DNA sequence: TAGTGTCTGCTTT
DNA sequence: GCAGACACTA
């Protein structure tokens, strides 16, 4: 019984996580100091929020961690009643802990919590503040309401560089001691695209299912990420090119056409070197497509009538 | 904290061993910890309200078959044990068991 | 008592005509227990409910449909949770123990079919429920899709039931049936009725059969031993007189946009759908060589066009006047 | 008893006056009941349709046709929250409106027709504005009245047969209702003047009616009524053509926007539109008399009706696509300007 | 250790930052409240999160409660409200304790929220004795994706139903978020009662360009002060994230209009308003606001043709069903349209919300006026026209009929 | 029994050797399973590439007579709701196995099809739960699913099947059911299918139920047209070749004739159409965009609905005008 | 004394 | 982002 590779190196403590080397130093002394404010931590999935936040709490408490913690999940009970009288229950109970340390409740996945649960921990945090102390554990900070954000320290989370994601892949790899190479990290860098959990599952489906850690197992058994082929369609110059590409990559590997359209919409929002005017002709169109594919109408003509007319209008005959 | 107690009178512990894995070597001293879920036992209060005798019997795996008698007719309910106990919890049991 | 379209059903898999593989298909099947998903699309009034009745009257017998054949419409809700519930229900249904008589009277298979009617009012969760229902219990039970259109029907669907396509009635496809109709209805007609009349209606047997009953009701109404000849059943079907159309052309020829607005306004005043006079003028048109390859692909766009504007459900009035203004300014 | 339509109603085949083929083909259909396939009609609003269909129900069944009864019921479409509808009830057939909304419309349809239906000396029901559906309950009416067509017959009257789908025009007959010439409306009006006595000046009045009514019966009975009231049962040569305020509106607003061309006459006209809207006005019929009142200004040209035209199509094509209705109404306003300078 | 924005809590009425006109209307309010001639029996005081509401109240009921405890905070439930509110109904006498509805009880339930109308309705005529003094303090903040008013926006509006807010016996004043003028004098103070500390670390000498960072970039005191702790606990070289606060329903028509300054390029600013209130910018009626407030760029003098192309893109926007693509493009194109035309923009009009219930409402009327007369017709004899007739026809000729008869 | 069931479900593979074409993602499941190691595998294509067939064949290899209480099997066709989710999988997880030494798998087929709150907790219970319990996502559309559950399930693409699998699958049918295809309707077979394995088996049971004999016959590429309905690739052919050169009439004539004959629909026709001209080169890089507009125009209107003959003759009109170009 | 900063709009169903 | 009117000391 082996446990997988993503969970079978978690961290637990803070010097062996990697990524924003500022807000691991910051948590650190947070956690020797002690003092511990109330914590709103947002970013992109899978680069190290809750685990950040586990091993802070871990090294504030110490063996305090069997009772001074209350981790309420998104997968429970999360409702407006039961959810306020536990927590008030939690933070209405005292231990022997240092004068400098103060009781920790994490709630992970508070995006999706209800708005009344929201009044109902501010509630809780305004009638309890000076015993218990709150960390949020959420992907955007844009569904906290403000008043909760108020009373609260954000911390954001930048996306995880080729150092950090580099480093932790050397570090695990000489744990497990497999040979790699060079060429087959980078490729894993780029199939990743920041992301370190991602990185972490496609080394080891390169391990179990070839061994040697190549660019051409990578790529063998996983693709290239579509973002970067959307982009690389769209602007390219001739139709031709456009149309023998899509095809080749997306209807070849076996790509639903609403997912195309909707990697292109993300990407032509996020473009950058394109007119605003060009733009917006181009999501006008996009969303034209989405509708006839949404009505049923999704073959591949419909695809390339698509670039056509997106190669019409950046050339503009 | 709720904690109920069945005592060792046998007008309702009659019989009463723990064994040893080996269903044959029964042992003094040692202590079998069961996670169980809310869930079943309340399905299965009902279930015990009318009866005679009820006989618990679980193995090492930590599935628990408990049948109840009520000449009457014979239930027998298999229930499912937790994965893993709460962190290091068991140990607390005991030491508030022997308080 | 009845009127024709439904007193003259087919009841049994050998009235139907001109459509061969299908009904070799389910002939085949009959003698057998291999019987696949059927997804049953095409034109409208092809007689998919026709075919999909009469080979479940020919599979299990008449005393079998109340506890083996369920059938959902849009008669009733169809929620997703009752959908749902619905079809897994009768999917988990078990295969009635059939009596003596079904089983020296008919073959009955060891399977019951689920009929889907006009499925392509279905939402997505639906679809899938329905999908993954009939793969989770493909054993003893059969699911049939009918629909009108075969993109609204999602891909996964499709893939999974076999395509039965429905080709069109045209006139050599139907001939012999709408005989057989006449001759049994004692209805006289000319030379070339019954070629107009299915001309008429394109791939629609339901509406040229309902033709045919207006033109004997009302022969018989006159009184005199009569023929029915092609005006009486182009006027009741809705067909412009041929010099009503040409004098259309001669207006969109000449250059005058006053005509052509007070034109329009009187043939609106007459009441006469649009559709029907744009399906003429294409064919007058094509059909018509005094013209160069230029203008005639500028109007069939112009036309296909209109006819997209109109199938949206559009004011006829602003579409046809503006489809004549096009075509005149060519 | 204080109308033309409802004092002077037809309540025969015979009586009829207008489209004697059209008398004739009902007659035909008439002759035997019993093989009476379900009816769609089609044609100009004010024709005379649901007279038609009255005609035809009374000659099939008999006396009390015309006689209707009141009764309401309550639909539920979600939870506790039911809407009614004010259906009207009769011997020997039935009568429905599509007043509900367009989504719930459909499962109201679906109850009803269910209830009608039953088992079974059919019971026929009439169909009104059977066009103004959304295209889900005309999947329950294909399926109803084809496996239930043993006692209901649905009688469908439609101005446009375009939004009708395809197999609700194949499963039901095309019944042509055109509208009567000047002639014969003429004739209908000197037939309702000489029985209530009124003064007639010169015959020319009831053809200016019938001209300014464009084929609509309702409408010139009820211009009609209006000079006789306003000119104390007097008619006159002098008098003016009095039409509804809304088509007045139409013209000034058409006027104006010919007038003027600018931002604020755009902001103006869309305040105009709003307080029409408020109305329970329909935004198509709008749009269509719009584009009529521009079509016929001489000061335009050939390319600026053509414009116009092909403007109103296209936003025609929007409000039919689209959902909400100013947008479509302002765009079209809003591109009449910049094309006609 | 203690929180800043605890420790520090105001003692006197100058340390709280509130506007000078603001603390006088509202002391003024109080003042007529407290006579035993009520002409308010309620104040509602809305706003922003975090722009000193109650502690107003805490330190004016501190000041003037000895001229003639402090509160009575209600717990965060129906029942329970209730008590409350008839106990503090029964406290006038020789306590004259304000009564405080600082965090309001549920009301994302349309049955509590409900009950909590009636007894405020009945609480507002209760024609009995005396009145206790009572506060409500509602936060304006829009509940994020998770409708006809609460999921969409939570403030006071959304909870009282236009008749509690329609009342003589009300003073609504609606606060403003904290001055920067008044956020740099307190974060000043901090400094100094913190100067030890401040002194510890190299922070001293690099404190005016954060100072003036955090109070532009954000309006809210308690958060402030929440980052500057965080920033002063802080050994250094960490980039300050401060509390990413709301745009406004009329803020949104107002950036996409005329722009924003902060943020030149068009597709940063439209991506950054999408990402942050994708609510706002895909629930229905903004797009009649754009179309209604489009004109006030110039005051109705820029071309024609820009117009026309604006309201023809809207119109294939609302051909979409709704699709957030429709919407992206329609801004992007009246963003981009404003920003080529803004060469020669002064004297901007002012904006309105685009009179879509009173369309509604008058249709309502138009339908129920209609039923009537329908009813009428069929109670004086047979007459049956179906709806669609009645507009066209009968909604003019019969009233004039039936007036000259 | 068998023999009585559709060709889609009667073949459907029961081990990893019967799952053709995707060999890396066998090998490479396999080389999981066999170190004991299940890293919450996710499954991605499209519809009949073996997604469920290959899980389903997987769970019967590494478990045998497990699957009755160790696989929860959830799909569309059963309530997934957000309290229903967080319960039967809270409590199928928290729950120790029995007496089997392995992971627990489950299944989860059609995942995409959940809301939002309850795929935040799946993927909360997915890297709670995990010291025991699995997790397998089915799903043919990403765009439905959160960003964070890709990220913390492997993510395998299932390509569309090549030449060869089909081929192989072709001969085992023709080996279990004693029939005969010649090579051309072995090509025709291969150019419809698409990648699909449900088509392919459902056209051949079409196509055996055509034949008055199954035995004593072999199967060409006419009855495989006949039954499918597909255009012949000549049909398709004769009707571009008299677009390009015969003007307007017998052009038109042409499309009739070939339209009434057998009774070819519009959409296959128009694809077909299309496929040849995908081959054809053009260098004017403008008509190519107005082909591809007009026709996806067409596409639409005949999914909307319309007149049949003038939709054809605007195909017609429209490649002409294209090509005039 | 004219700029800079800053309150108030502008929302009802 | 806009305007209309007021704050506040140089
Ligand atoms: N900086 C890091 N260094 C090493 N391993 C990391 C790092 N960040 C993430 N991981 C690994 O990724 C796993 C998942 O991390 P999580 O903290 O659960 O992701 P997250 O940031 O909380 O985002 P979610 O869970 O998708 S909302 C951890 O258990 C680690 O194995
Ligand atoms: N092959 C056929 N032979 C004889 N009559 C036929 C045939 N197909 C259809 N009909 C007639 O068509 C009429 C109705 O047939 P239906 O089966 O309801 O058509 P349809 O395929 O169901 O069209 P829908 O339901 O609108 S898609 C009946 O009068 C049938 O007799
Ligand atoms: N100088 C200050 N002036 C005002 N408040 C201060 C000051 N210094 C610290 N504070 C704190 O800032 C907070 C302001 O309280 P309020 O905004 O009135 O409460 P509130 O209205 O409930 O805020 P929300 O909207 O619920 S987050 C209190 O916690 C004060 O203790
Ligand atoms: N690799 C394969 N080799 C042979 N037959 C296959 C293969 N993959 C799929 N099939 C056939 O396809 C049938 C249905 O495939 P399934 O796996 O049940 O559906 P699916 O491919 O998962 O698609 P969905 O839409 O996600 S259920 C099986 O019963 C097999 O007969
Ligand atoms: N043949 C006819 N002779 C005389 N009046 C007729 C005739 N047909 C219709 N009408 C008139 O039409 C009016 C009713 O029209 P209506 O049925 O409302 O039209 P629609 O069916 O288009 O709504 C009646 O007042 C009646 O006087
Ligand atoms: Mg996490
Ligand atoms: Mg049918
Ligand atoms: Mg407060
Ligand atoms: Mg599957």
Same mark, same amino acid.
């Given at each position: ?97 240092? +004068? ?20 109902? $921990? ?15 554990? *959420? ?179 | ?11 309702? $512990? ?63 309910? *298999? ?21 | ?154 891909? +996964?669907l499709a893939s999974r039931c076999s395509k039965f396509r429905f080709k069109a009635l045209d006139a050599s496809n139907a001939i012999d049936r709408l005989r057989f109709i006449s001759e049994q209805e004692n209805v006289k007609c000319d030379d070339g009725v019954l070629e107009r009349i299915l001309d008429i209606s394109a791939g629609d047997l339901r509406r040229g059969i309902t033709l045919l009953q207006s033109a004997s009701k009302g022969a018989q109404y006159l009184g005199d031993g009569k #023929? ?103 | ?28 259909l008439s002759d035997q009941p019993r093989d009476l396939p379900h009816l769609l009609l089609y044609g100009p609003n004010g024709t005379g349709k649901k007279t038609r269909c009255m005609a035809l129900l009374e000659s099939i069944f008999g006396p009390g046709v015309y006689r209707l009864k009141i009764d309401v019921r309550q639909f539920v479409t979600a939870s506790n929250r039911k809407l009614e509808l004010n259906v009207v009830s009769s011997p020997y057939h039935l009568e429905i409106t599509p ?47 084809? @496996? ?91 008098? +003016?053509?009095? @039409? ?93 300007? *910049? *094309?006609?300078? | ?203 001293? #000498? ?170 009428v017709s069929l109670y004086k004899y047979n007459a049956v026209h179906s709806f669609r007739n009645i507009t066209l026809e009968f909604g003019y000729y019969a009233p004039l009929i039936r007036k000259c008869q | 029994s068998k023999e009585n069931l559709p060709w889609v479900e009667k073949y459907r593979p029961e081990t990893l050797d019967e799952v053709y074409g995707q060999n890396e993602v066998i090998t490479t499941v396999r080389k999981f399973v066999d170190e004991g190691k299940l890293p919450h ?285």
């Open positions: 019984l082996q446990l997988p590779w993503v969970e079978k190196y978690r961290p637990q403590v803070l010097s062996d996580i990697v990524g924003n080397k500022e807000t691991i130093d910051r948590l650190q002394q947070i956690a020797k100091d002690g003092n511990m404010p109330h914590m709103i931590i947002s970013g992109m999935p899978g680069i190290g929020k809750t685990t950040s936040v586990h091993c802070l709490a871990h090294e504030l408490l110490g063996r305090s961690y069997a009772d001074g913690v209350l981790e309420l999940n998104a997968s429970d009970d999360r409702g407006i009643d039961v959810v306020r009288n536990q927590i008030k229950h939690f933070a209405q109970k005292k231990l022997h802990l240092p +004068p400098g340390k103060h009781k920790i409740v994490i709630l992970d996945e508070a995006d999706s919590m209800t708005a009344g649960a929201q009044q109902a $921990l501010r509630r809780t945090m305004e009638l309890y503040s000076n015993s218990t102390r709150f960390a949020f554990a *959420c992907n955007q900070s844009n569904k906290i309401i403000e008043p909760l954000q108020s009373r609260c320290a954000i911390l954001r989370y930048s996306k995880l560089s080729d150092e950090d994601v580099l480093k932790r892949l050397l570090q695990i790899i000489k744990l497990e001691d497999v040979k790699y190479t060079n060429d087959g990290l980078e490729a894993i860098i780029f199939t990743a695209e920041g992301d370190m959990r991602q990185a972490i599952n496609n080394l080891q489906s390169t391990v179990a299912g070839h061994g040697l850690v190549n660019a051409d197992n990578v790529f063998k058994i996983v693709d290239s990420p579509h973002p970067l082929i959307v982009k690389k369609m769209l602007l390219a110059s001739n139709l031709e090119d456009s149309i023998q590409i899509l095809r080749t990559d997306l209807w070849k590997k076996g790509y639903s056409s609403i997912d195309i359209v909707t990697t292109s919409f993300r990407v032509t929002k996020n473009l950058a070197q394109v007119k605003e005017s060009v733009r917006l002709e181009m999501i006008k169109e996009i969303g034209l497509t989405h509708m006839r594919i949404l009505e049923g109408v999704g073959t591949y003509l419909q695809l390339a009538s698509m670039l056509a007319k997106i190669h019409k209008l950046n050339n503009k005959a | 904290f709720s904690k109920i107690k069945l005592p060792s009178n046998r007008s309702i $512990l009659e019989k009463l061993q723990v064994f040893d894995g080996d269903s044959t070597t029964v042992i003094d001293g040692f202590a079998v910890i069961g996670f169980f879920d809310f869930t079943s036992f309340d399905k299965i209060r009902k279930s015990t309200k009318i009866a005679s005798k009820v006989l618990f019997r679980m193995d090492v795996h930590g599935v628990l078959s408990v049948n109840i008698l009520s000449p009457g007719i014979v239930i027998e309910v *298999c229930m499912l044990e937790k994965e893993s106990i709460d962190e290091a919890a068991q140990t607390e049991i005991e030491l508030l068991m022997e308080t | 008592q009845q009127p024709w379209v439904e007193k003259y059903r087919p009841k049994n898999l050998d009235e139907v005509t001109a459509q061969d593989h299908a009904v070799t298909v389910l002939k085949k099947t009959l003698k057998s227990a291999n019987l696949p998903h059927m997804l049953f699309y095409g034109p409208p009034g092809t007689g998919k409910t026709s075919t999909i009745l009469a080979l479940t009257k020919e599979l299990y017998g008449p005393d079998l449909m109340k506890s083996r054949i369920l059938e959902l419409n849009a008669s009733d809700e169809r929620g997703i949770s009752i959908v749902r519930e619905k079809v897994k229900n009768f999917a988990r249904l078990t295969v009635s123990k059939p009596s003596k008589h079904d089983l020296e009277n008919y073959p009955c298979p060891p399977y019951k079919i689920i009929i889907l009617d006009e499925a392509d009012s279905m939402t997505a969760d639906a679809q899938s429920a329905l999908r993954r229902t009939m793969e989770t219990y493909s054993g003893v039970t059969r699911f049939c899709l009918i629909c009108n259109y075969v993109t609204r029907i999602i891909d +996964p #023929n029915i000849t092609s005006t009486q059943v182009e006027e009741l079907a809705g067909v412009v007189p041929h010099d009503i159309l040409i004098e259309i052309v001669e207006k969109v020829k000449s250059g005058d946009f006053d005509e052509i607005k007070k034109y329009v306004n009187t043939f609106m005043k007459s009441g006469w759908s649009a559709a029907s006079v744009v399906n003429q003028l294409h064919e007058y048109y094509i059909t018509n060589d005094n013209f160069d390859t230029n203008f005639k692909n500028q109007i069939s766009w112009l036309l296909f066009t209109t006819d997209s504007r109109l199938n949206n459900g559009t004011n006829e009035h602003i579409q046809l006047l503006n489809l004549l203004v096009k075509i005149s300014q060519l | 008893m204080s109308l033309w339509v409802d004092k002077y109603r037809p309540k025969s085949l015979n009586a009829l006056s207008h489209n004697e083929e059209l008398t004739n083909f009902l007659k035909s007043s509900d909304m367009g989504n719930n419309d459909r499962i109201v349809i679906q109850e009803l027709l269910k209830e009608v239906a039953q088992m079974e000396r059919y019971k026929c029901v009439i169909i009104n504005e059977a066009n103004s559906l959304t295209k889900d309950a005309q999947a329950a009416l294909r399926r109803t009245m084809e @496996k239930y067509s043993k006692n209901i017959r649905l009688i469908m009257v439609c101005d446009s047969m375009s939004p009708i789908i395809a197999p609700i025009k194949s499963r039901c007959l095309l019944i042509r209702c055109p509208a009567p010439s000047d002639s014969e409306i003429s004739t209908i009006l000197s037939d309702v003047v000489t029985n209530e006595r009124i003064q007639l000046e010169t015959k020319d009045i009831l053809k200016r009616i019938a001209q300014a009514s464009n084929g609509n019966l309702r409408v010139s009975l009820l211009m009609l009524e209006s000079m006789a009231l306003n000119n104390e049962l007097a008619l006159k040569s002098s008098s +003016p053509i009095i @039409k509804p305020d809304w088509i007045i509106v139409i013209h000034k607003l058409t006027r104006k926007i010919v007038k003027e061309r600018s931002v604020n006459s755009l902001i103006e006209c869309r305040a105009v539109l709003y307080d029409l809207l408020a109305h329970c006005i329909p935004a198509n019929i709008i749009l269509k008399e719009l584009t009529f009142s521009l079509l016929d200004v001489e000061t335009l040209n050939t390319t600026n009706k053509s414009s116009i035209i092909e403007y109103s199509s296209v936003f025609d094509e929007r409000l039919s696509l689209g959902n909400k209705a100013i947008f479509h109404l302002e765009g079209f306003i809003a591109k009449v300007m *910049c *094309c006609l300078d | 250790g203690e929180q800043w924005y605890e420790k520090f809590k105001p003692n006197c009425l100058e340390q709280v930052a509130i506007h000078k006109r603001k603390l006088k209307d509202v002391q003024e309010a109080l003042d007529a409240m407290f006579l035993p001639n009520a002409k308010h029996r309620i104040l509602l005081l809305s706003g922003p999160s975090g722009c000193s509401k109650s502690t107003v109240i805490k330190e004016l009921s501190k000041i003037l409660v000895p001229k003639y405890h402090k509160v009575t905070e209600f717990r965060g439930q129906m029942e329970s409200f209730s008590e409350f509110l008839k106990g503090a109904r029964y406290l006038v006498m020789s306590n004259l304790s304000l009564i405080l509805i600082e965090d309001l009880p549920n009301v994302f339930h349309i049955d509590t929220r409900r009950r909590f109308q009636q007894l405020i309705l009945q609480w507002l005529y209760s024609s009995e004795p005396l009145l206790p003094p009572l506060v409500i303090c509602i936060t304006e903040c829009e509940i994020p994706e998770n409708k006809f008013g609460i999921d969409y926006t939570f403030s006071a509006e959304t909870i009282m139903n236009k008749e509690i807010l329609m009342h003589p016996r009300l003073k609504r004043i609606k606060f403003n978020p904290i001055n920067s003028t008044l956020l740099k004098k307190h974060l000043k103070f901090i400094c100094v009662q913190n100067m030890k500390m401040l002194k510890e670390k190299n922070k001293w #000498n690099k404190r005016q360009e954060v100072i003036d960072y955090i109070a532009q970039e954000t309006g809210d005191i308690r958060s402030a002060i929440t980052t500057l702790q965080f920033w002063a606990t802080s050994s250094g070289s960490l980039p300050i994230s401060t509390r990413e606060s709301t745009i406004s329903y009329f803020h949104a028509i107002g950036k996409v209009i005329h722009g924003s300054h902060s943020t030149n390029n068009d597709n940063e600013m439209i991506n950054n308003l999408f990402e942050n209130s994708n609510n706002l910018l895909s629930k229905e009626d903004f797009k009649l606001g754009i179309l209604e407030n489009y004109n006030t760029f110039n005051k109705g003098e820029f071309s024609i043709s820009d117009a026309s192309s604006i309201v023809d893109c809207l119109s294939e926007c609302d051909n979409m069903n709704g699709l957030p693509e429709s919407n992206e493009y329609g801004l992007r194109e009246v963003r981009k349209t404003f920003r080529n035309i803004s060469k020669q923009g002064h004297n901007h009009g002012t904006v309105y919300f685009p009179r879509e219930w009173k369309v509604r409402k008058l249709q309502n009327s138009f339908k129920v006026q209609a039923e009537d007369w329908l009813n | 595998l996710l499954f991605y294509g499209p519809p009949g590439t073996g997604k469920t067939s290959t899980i389903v064949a997987l769970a019967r290899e590494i478990y045998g007579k497990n699957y009755s209480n160790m696989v929860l099997e959830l799909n569309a066709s059963d309530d997934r709701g957000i309290d229903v989710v967080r319960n039967q999988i809270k409590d199928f997880a928290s729950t120790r196995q029995i007496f089997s030494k392995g992971f627990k798998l489950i299944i989860l087929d059609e995942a995409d099809a959940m809301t939002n709150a309850a795929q935040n907790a799946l993927r909360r219970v997915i890297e709670r739960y995990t010291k025991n319990t699995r997790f397998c996502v089915l799903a043919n559309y990403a765009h439905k699913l959160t960003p964070a559950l890709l990220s913390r399930c492997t993510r395998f693409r299932f390509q569309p099947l090549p030449q060869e699998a089909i081929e192989r699958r072709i001969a085992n049918v023709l080996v279990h059911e004693k029939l005969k295809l010649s090579p051309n309707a072995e090509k025709a077979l291969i150019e419809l299918s698409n990648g699909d394995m449900r088509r392919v088996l459902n056209v051949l049971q079409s196509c055996k139920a055509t034949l008055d004999n199954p035995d004593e016959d072999e199967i060409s590429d006419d009855v495989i047209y006949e039954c499918c309905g597909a255009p012949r690739p000549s049909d398709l052919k004769a009707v571009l070749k008299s677009i390009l050169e015969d003007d307007w009439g017998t052009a038109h004539y042409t499309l009739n004739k070939v339209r009434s004959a057998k009774g070819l629909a519009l959409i296959d026709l128009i694809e077909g159409i299309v496929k040849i001209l995908e081959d054809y080169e053009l260098q004017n890089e403008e008509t190519r965009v107005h082909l591809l507009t007009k026709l996806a125009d067409i596409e639409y209107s005949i999914s909307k609905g319309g007149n049949d003959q003038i939709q054809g003759s605007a195909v017609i009109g429209a490649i002409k005008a294209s090509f005039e170009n």
